[PDB]
């Protein structure tokens, strides 16, 4: 079963974990596998707040931030509040064959360097 890959750069508090319906606040840089940046909250000067686990972000983000809607998965570490991680998300858990014209091409793997600042 398809899952994003998660590299834990530095662990957070190891006790606060988002569940579906929670709001999270996160800084990120989104790049293609070739290092070309397609988006970033940091250059925007403000972190990104979203509701997780309910399809209001790409599935790869939902799975990563909620640890597969609480179900976990093989080699899928939990991301606690304060954690720095790198999420690598296959196209089927992102924008698929369709992509986003002029921003993300077809069947693109996305790499997000993230810091989870807040959970609820």
Numbering used by the authors: 3 to 122
From the paper:
The 12-kDa FK506-binding protein (FKBP12) is a ubiquitously expressed peptidyl-prolyl isomerase with considerable homology between fungal pathogens and is thus a prime candidate for future targeting efforts to generate a panfungal strategy.
Interestingly, initial attempts to obtain crystals of the protein-FK506 complex failed, as the intermolecular interaction appeared to be strongly favored, leading to the production of the same apo crystal forms. Thus, we generated a P104G mutation in C. albicans FKBP12 and crystallized and obtained the apo FKBP12(P104G) structure to 2.0 Å. Strikingly, this structure did not harbor the self-catalysis-like interaction.
